[PDB]
Scaffold this active site. Structure first.
Site, mmCIF file in Angstrom:
data_model
loop_
_atom_site.group_PDB
_atom_site.id
_atom_site.type_symbol
_atom_site.label_atom_id
_atom_site.label_comp_id
_atom_site.label_asym_id
_atom_site.label_seq_id
_atom_site.Cartn_x
_atom_site.Cartn_y
_atom_site.Cartn_z
ATOM 1 N N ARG A 151 0.778 -1.131 -0.154
ATOM 2 C CA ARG A 151 -0.017 0.058 -0.066
ATOM 3 C C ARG A 151 0.744 0.986 -0.008
ATOM 4 N NH1 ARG A 151 -3.407 -3.529 3.697
ATOM 5 N NH2 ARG A 151 -1.475 -2.771 5.163
ATOM 6 N N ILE A 152 1.830 1.207 0.792
ATOM 7 C CA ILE A 152 2.674 2.567 0.985
ATOM 8 C C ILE A 152 3.548 2.734 -0.174
ATOM 9 C CG2 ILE A 152 4.224 3.959 2.424
ATOM 10 C CD1 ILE A 152 1.509 3.577 3.716
ATOM 11 N N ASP B 67 10.038 -6.432 -4.485
ATOM 12 C CA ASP B 67 9.081 -7.087 -3.550
ATOM 13 C C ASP B 67 8.557 -8.808 -4.131
ATOM 14 O OD1 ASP B 67 6.545 -8.175 -2.050
ATOM 15 O OD2 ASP B 67 5.963 -5.928 -2.047
ATOM 16 N N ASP C 27 12.037 7.403 10.558
ATOM 17 C CA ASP C 27 10.706 7.473 11.717
ATOM 18 C C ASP C 27 10.541 6.390 12.420
ATOM 19 O OD1 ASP C 27 8.244 9.116 12.081
ATOM 20 O OD2 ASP C 27 7.229 7.197 11.221
ATOM 21 N N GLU D 260 13.410 0.679 20.424
ATOM 22 C CA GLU D 260 12.114 1.855 20.386
ATOM 23 C C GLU D 260 11.567 2.202 22.002
ATOM 24 O OE1 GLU D 260 8.227 2.928 17.924
ATOM 25 O OE2 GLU D 260 10.047 2.922 16.564
ATOM 26 N N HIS E 231 8.472 8.441 15.037
ATOM 27 C CA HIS E 231 7.366 7.384 14.795
ATOM 28 C C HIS E 231 6.012 8.141 14.589
ATOM 29 C CE1 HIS E 231 6.329 2.859 14.749
ATOM 30 N NE2 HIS E 231 5.626 3.460 13.977
HETATM 31 N N1 LIG Z 1 -3.363 6.689 12.816
HETATM 32 C C1 LIG Z 1 -2.815 6.130 13.675
HETATM 33 O O1 LIG Z 1 -2.392 5.149 13.689
HETATM 34 C C2 LIG Z 1 -2.738 6.996 15.001
HETATM 35 C C3 LIG Z 1 -3.490 7.895 15.375
HETATM 36 C C4 LIG Z 1 -3.468 8.527 16.549
HETATM 37 C C5 LIG Z 1 -2.368 8.395 17.268
HETATM 38 N N2 LIG Z 1 -1.355 7.489 17.120
HETATM 39 C C6 LIG Z 1 -0.072 7.007 17.855
HETATM 40 O O2 LIG Z 1 0.358 5.965 17.623
HETATM 41 C C7 LIG Z 1 0.481 5.105 18.584
HETATM 42 C C8 LIG Z 1 -0.177 3.952 18.299
HETATM 43 O O3 LIG Z 1 -0.881 3.859 17.261
HETATM 44 P P1 LIG Z 1 -1.572 2.153 16.822
HETATM 45 O O4 LIG Z 1 -1.190 1.037 18.022
HETATM 46 O O5 LIG Z 1 -3.119 2.357 16.903
HETATM 47 O O6 LIG Z 1 -0.951 1.686 15.342
HETATM 48 P P2 LIG Z 1 -0.549 0.186 15.306
HETATM 49 O O7 LIG Z 1 -0.522 0.126 13.730
HETATM 50 O O8 LIG Z 1 -1.362 -0.816 16.081
HETATM 51 O O9 LIG Z 1 1.192 0.257 15.847
HETATM 52 C C9 LIG Z 1 1.094 -0.637 16.902
HETATM 53 C C10 LIG Z 1 2.737 -0.818 17.437
HETATM 54 O O10 LIG Z 1 2.951 -2.122 17.054
HETATM 55 C C11 LIG Z 1 3.937 -2.307 15.954
HETATM 56 N N3 LIG Z 1 3.450 -2.741 14.786
HETATM 57 C C12 LIG Z 1 3.418 -2.315 13.678
HETATM 58 N N4 LIG Z 1 2.357 -3.331 12.895
HETATM 59 C C13 LIG Z 1 2.609 -4.298 13.604
HETATM 60 C C14 LIG Z 1 1.826 -5.692 13.157
HETATM 61 N N5 LIG Z 1 1.305 -5.994 11.916
HETATM 62 N N6 LIG Z 1 1.865 -6.366 14.157
HETATM 63 C C15 LIG Z 1 2.209 -6.193 15.332
HETATM 64 N N7 LIG Z 1 2.747 -4.957 15.742
HETATM 65 C C16 LIG Z 1 3.096 -4.170 14.889
HETATM 66 C C17 LIG Z 1 4.776 -1.149 15.888
HETATM 67 O O11 LIG Z 1 5.562 -0.898 16.704
HETATM 68 P P3 LIG Z 1 7.142 -1.946 16.872
HETATM 69 O O12 LIG Z 1 7.384 -1.858 15.361
HETATM 70 O O13 LIG Z 1 8.164 -1.454 17.741
HETATM 71 O O14 LIG Z 1 6.927 -3.394 17.034
HETATM 72 C C18 LIG Z 1 3.499 -0.235 16.040
HETATM 73 O O15 LIG Z 1 4.053 1.101 16.543
HETATM 74 C C19 LIG Z 1 -0.210 5.879 19.703
HETATM 75 O O16 LIG Z 1 0.612 5.850 20.747
HETATM 76 C C20 LIG Z 1 -0.569 7.146 19.271
HETATM 77 O O17 LIG Z 1 0.352 8.137 20.126
HETATM 78 C C21 LIG Z 1 -1.553 7.001 15.698
HETATM 79 N N1 LIG Z 2 3.763 5.317 11.375
HETATM 80 C C1 LIG Z 2 4.606 4.665 10.394
HETATM 81 O O1 LIG Z 2 5.842 4.370 10.424
HETATM 82 C C2 LIG Z 2 3.849 3.493 9.756
HETATM 83 C C3 LIG Z 2 2.455 3.382 9.602
HETATM 84 C C4 LIG Z 2 1.931 2.397 8.658
HETATM 85 C C5 LIG Z 2 2.629 1.482 8.432
HETATM 86 N N2 LIG Z 2 3.969 1.280 8.591
HETATM 87 C C6 LIG Z 2 4.760 0.445 8.333
HETATM 88 O O2 LIG Z 2 4.920 0.342 6.588
HETATM 89 C C7 LIG Z 2 5.239 -0.744 6.167
HETATM 90 C C8 LIG Z 2 4.431 -0.923 4.800
HETATM 91 O O3 LIG Z 2 3.142 -0.620 5.239
HETATM 92 P P1 LIG Z 2 1.856 -1.287 4.157
HETATM 93 O O4 LIG Z 2 0.609 -0.725 4.612
HETATM 94 O O5 LIG Z 2 2.171 -0.635 2.604
HETATM 95 O O6 LIG Z 2 1.916 -2.745 4.242
HETATM 96 P P2 LIG Z 2 1.579 -3.947 2.992
HETATM 97 O O7 LIG Z 2 1.322 -5.017 3.948
HETATM 98 O O8 LIG Z 2 0.389 -3.254 2.393
HETATM 99 O O9 LIG Z 2 2.781 -4.012 1.994
HETATM 100 C C9 LIG Z 2 4.099 -4.570 2.603
HETATM 101 C C10 LIG Z 2 4.693 -5.293 1.445
HETATM 102 O O10 LIG Z 2 5.903 -5.893 1.826
HETATM 103 C C11 LIG Z 2 6.191 -6.938 1.013
HETATM 104 N N3 LIG Z 2 7.278 -7.676 1.349
HETATM 105 C C12 LIG Z 2 7.158 -8.795 2.035
HETATM 106 N N4 LIG Z 2 8.239 -9.456 1.973
HETATM 107 C C13 LIG Z 2 9.186 -8.561 1.623
HETATM 108 C C14 LIG Z 2 10.403 -9.073 1.239
HETATM 109 N N5 LIG Z 2 11.573 -9.954 1.569
HETATM 110 N N6 LIG Z 2 11.232 -7.839 0.418
HETATM 111 C C15 LIG Z 2 10.675 -7.037 -0.148
HETATM 112 N N7 LIG Z 2 9.292 -6.759 0.120
HETATM 113 C C16 LIG Z 2 8.619 -7.689 0.855
HETATM 114 C C17 LIG Z 2 5.061 -7.583 1.020
HETATM 115 O O11 LIG Z 2 4.869 -8.379 -0.215
HETATM 116 C C18 LIG Z 2 4.154 -6.385 1.052
HETATM 117 O O12 LIG Z 2 3.721 -6.260 -0.561
HETATM 118 C C19 LIG Z 2 4.948 -1.938 7.141
HETATM 119 O O13 LIG Z 2 5.973 -2.342 7.820
HETATM 120 C C20 LIG Z 2 4.185 -1.139 8.240
HETATM 121 O O14 LIG Z 2 4.110 -1.797 9.436
HETATM 122 C C21 LIG Z 2 4.577 2.295 9.336
#
Ligand SMILES: NC(=O)c1ccc[n+]([C@@H]2O[C@H](COP(=O)([O-])OP(=O)(O)OC[C@H]3O[C@@H](n4cnc5c(N)ncnc54)[C@H](OP(=O)(O)O)[C@@H]3O)[C@@H](O)[C@H]2O)c1
Ligand SMILES: NC(=O)c1ccc[n+]([C@@H]2O[C@H](COP(=O)([O-])OP(=O)(O)OC[C@H]3O[C@@H](n4cnc5c(N)ncnc54)[C@H](O)[C@@H]3O)[C@@H](O)[C@H]2O)c1
Ligand SMILES: NC(=O)c1ccc[n+]([C@@H]2O[C@H](COP(=O)([O-])OP(=O)(O)OC[C@H]3O[C@@H](n4cnc5c(N)ncnc54)[C@H](OP(=O)(O)O)[C@@H]3O)[C@@H](O)[C@H]2O)c1
Ligand SMILES: NC(=O)c1ccc[n+]([C@@H]2O[C@H](COP(=O)([O-])OP(=O)(O)OC[C@H]3O[C@@H](n4cnc5c(N)ncnc54)[C@H](OP(=O)(O)O)[C@@H]3O)[C@@H](O)[C@H]2O)c1
Ligand SMILES: NC(=O)c1ccc[n+]([C@@H]2O[C@H](COP(=O)([O-])OP(=O)(O)OC[C@H]3O[C@@H](n4cnc5c(N)ncnc54)[C@H](O)[C@@H]3O)[C@@H](O)[C@H]2O)c1
Lengths: 318, 318
Positions: free
Chosen positions: B149-150, B170, B256, B261, B280
């Site tokens: 997606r991103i 990918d 980011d 962390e 983040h």
């Molecule tokens: N649009 C938003 O999401 C939003 C809105 C308002 C505030 N916030 C801020 O974001 C913080 C948390 O947001 P959220 O928990 O609702 O979003 P989240 O997607 O549930 O992120 C939760 C944390 O778990 C880890 N994570 C990411 N993808 C994961 C996955 N597939 N499986 C397991 N862990 C994953 C990441 O930390 P690690 O990589 O370190 O494991 C991520 O920071 C809050 O403290 C708030 O200040 C976010």
């Molecule tokens: N606040 C933030 O910084 C923030 C917010 C949202 C998502 N993310 C992170 O951004 C990343 C991408 O988000 P998304 O919504 O686009 O996820 P997504 O699931 O839509 O896409 C992730 C891609 O990773 C690819 N991938 C898997 N294995 C791979 C490999 N060995 N090499 C290269 N690519 C591979 C998968 O095929 C998939 O297409 C995720 O790690 C998500 O946790 C960060």
């Protein structure tokens, strides 16, 4: 023979002239040095802001083409060259892409509060993430002042790629030009001010645009809105911007050009975390420098081959 | 009855649940408070990082659906819910636009050396403009790791609007997905590493991508290239990034996300002027919060009406 009064912005322009002409380069041009080297040359390159007056043009017997390094041609006696049959060409617009990207960089940096958040992390205050929230550009309104080369290119990116609503104010462009870059041309500047979440200035500096953005403009702007200026420092009345930031008439500003320039070491804008700066570098990339060098070198060769160059300043000589 | 363990990120999701269910909100949730309010409710929303363990799930007699606030479900005992027939849904992909814009902001900020130039000007070193030269993005190569997606949204903007050549790595995406966003899918990550001027990480964190960017990857990258990581901190081995920056194996980085962390006050990356940070926040905009709140509220209602929600984490219970 071709004389380079000052070095070009890139060595690629000097090598191209050396491929077809005998080129002499004066690195630190003095007025007497020009007189003794211009008498027999056929083309002249003038690096801003070195002047080329009637005395040097009068001594240049074989001169046919004079080229500046950029847009500015104020230092050249245009009247003296027209009478002698010499065509003069400038090199404008060759950093259009650089300033466009630089403008985009500043709009996004304000939206994401990048410099502030980066400083917070580096000071161990990662937990600022709980108080501060970035802005999403999609759906916001960008107000563009001046829909020229840069303004149009910035409008085009923000309207399509970033999905922003783009307003434009420019009374001297055809009424349909905003539609080519998916912007809406507005007739009243006040309308752009009250509707925009981001205002980016790209006008030419004229008597009409000089200090166009004063305190009256900042009051009409949204208090949550940001100002970006990559055009000229004199377009903004800087004391009114200082007041606008301090009194929170606007939410922030990004500034690449200053009045006066260079800015003083203790400029009062420096203290604000929501004002970001670059030292007049928006148009300075290696690619823009090469393009300027190639454009200047190539227009010299066009005149020496009877071909009409694209940026003639005195068209009545061709 | 629906229980909100913690507030949603926006009130729009809580109002939508109130239209169809009796909603109770525990603002600062304690474990015993969860025990005393979950016994008769049919749906549960859990605000990260509050935990929902086997004791609470065991007390929830009428529970059918549990929704997290985001991607993460580590704080939920999925196994205890799977045995009881309770569906668990997360809410991923609701901040795609925010992270895309934030990624662009960091790519641009590195190319224009924005934080460093801003710091120099505020410190009275305006003359740094004689030392530093920005980079023009047009014509450069962006390497995208993870074309999800991103990654796809970043690819589409950078390829057309910013006129970059976009490579993607990918191995799990259809071969034609890169063409829809005018990118080239490459099978060899080494090709992307040696060809890219900017490398932006957007993969899912798996055992395959965990520390995928180590010292060997940084050695293959161009010494002039930049790294951007908005995905997960564990995708990069941080000590190797420190070595890569210090030994100039790469030219800079924008970060980011961190491992570990939160980053500490004495992170060795903080000393380098060519590394920039955000705490983040790439996905944290008001719009993203609204979408996450709507998605969580809607997946709860879908389960309470027998409709299969799109983000079930334990599909074997449907
Ligand atoms: N649009 C938003 O999401 C939003 C809105 C308002 C505030 N916030 C801020 O974001 C913080 C948390 O947001 P959220 O928990 O609702 O979003 P989240 O997607 O549930 O992120 C939760 C944390 O778990 C880890 N994570 C990411 N993808 C994961 C996955 N597939 N499986 C397991 N862990 C994953 C990441 O930390 P690690 O990589 O370190 O494991 C991520 O920071 C809050 O403290 C708030 O200040 C976010
Ligand atoms: N606040 C933030 O910084 C923030 C917010 C949202 C998502 N993310 C992170 O951004 C990343 C991408 O988000 P998304 O919504 O686009 O996820 P997504 O699931 O839509 O896409 C992730 C891609 O990773 C690819 N991938 C898997 N294995 C791979 C490999 N060995 N090499 C290269 N690519 C591979 C998968 O095929 C998939 O297409 C995720 O790690 C998500 O946790 C960060
Ligand atoms: N450097 C930037 O790009 C930038 C932009 C806007 C705001 N900020 C700073 O961010 C902080 C929070 O500002 P705010 O808009 O969120 O209002 P605030 O919460 O009232 O402070 C303030 O200190 C402000 O100066 C920085
Ligand atoms: N976004 C940034 O903050 C950023 C990015 C690149 C370089 N820089 C800094 O700018 C200065 C110029 O370095 P360079 O990239 O042109 O290479 P170099 O000075 O030739 O080494 C250095 O001090 C570097 O640390 C900052
Ligand atoms: N390093 C830098 O920061 C840098 C580099 C290049 C150019 N610039 C500056 O950026 C600005 C734009 O450059 P350009 O190439 O796009 O110029 P341009 O000539 O292509 O367009 C300028 C526009 O200003 C418009 N304009 C004139 N009067 C106006 C008014 N009263 N109100 C609103 N608009 C008005 C004109 O109609 C014209 O379309 C110029 O001031 C130029 O000097 C800065």
């Amino acid at each position: 023979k071709v004389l380079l009064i000052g070095k070009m912005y890139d060595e690629i322009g000097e090598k191209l002239l050396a491929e077809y002409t005998n080129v002499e380069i004066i690195k630190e041009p003095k007025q007497h040095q020009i007189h003794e080297a211009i008498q027999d040359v056929s083309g002249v390159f003038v690096r801003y802001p070195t002047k080329l007056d009637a005395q040097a043009i009068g001594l240049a017997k074989n001169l046919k083409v004079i080229s500046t390094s950029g847009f500015g041609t104020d230092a050249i006696d245009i009247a003296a060259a027209t009478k002698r049959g010499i065509v003069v060409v400038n090199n404008p617009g060759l950093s259009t892409t650089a300033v466009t990207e630089h403008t985009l960089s500043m709009i996004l940096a304000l939206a994401k509060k990048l410099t502030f958040l980066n400083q917070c992390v580096k000071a161990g205050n990662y937990l600022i993430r709980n108080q501060v929230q970035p802005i999403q550009l999609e759906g916001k309104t960008l107000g563009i002042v001046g829909l020229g080369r840069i303004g149009s290119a910035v409008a085009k990116i923000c309207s399509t790629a970033l999905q922003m609503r783009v307003l434009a104010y420019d009374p001297y462009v055809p009424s349909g030009k905003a539609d080519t870059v998916r912007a809406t041309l507005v007739q009243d500047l006040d309308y752009l001010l009250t509707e925009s979440d981001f205002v980016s200035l790209h006008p030419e500096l004229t008597d009409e645009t000089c200090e166009m953005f004063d305190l009256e403009a900042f009051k009409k702007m949204k208090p949550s809105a940001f100002l970006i200026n990559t055009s000229r420092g004199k377009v903004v009345r800087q004391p009114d911007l200082v007041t606008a930031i301090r009194e929170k008439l606007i939410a922030g500003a990004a500034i690449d050009v200053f009045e006066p320039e260079p800015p003083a070491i203790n400029n009062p804008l420096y203290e604000f975390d929501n004002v970001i700066f670059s030292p007049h570098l928006a148009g300075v990339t290696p690619e823009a420098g090469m393009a300027a060098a190639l454009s200047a070198a190539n227009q010299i060769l066009q005149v020496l081959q009877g071909e009409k160059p694209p940026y003639i300043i005195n068209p009545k000589v061709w």
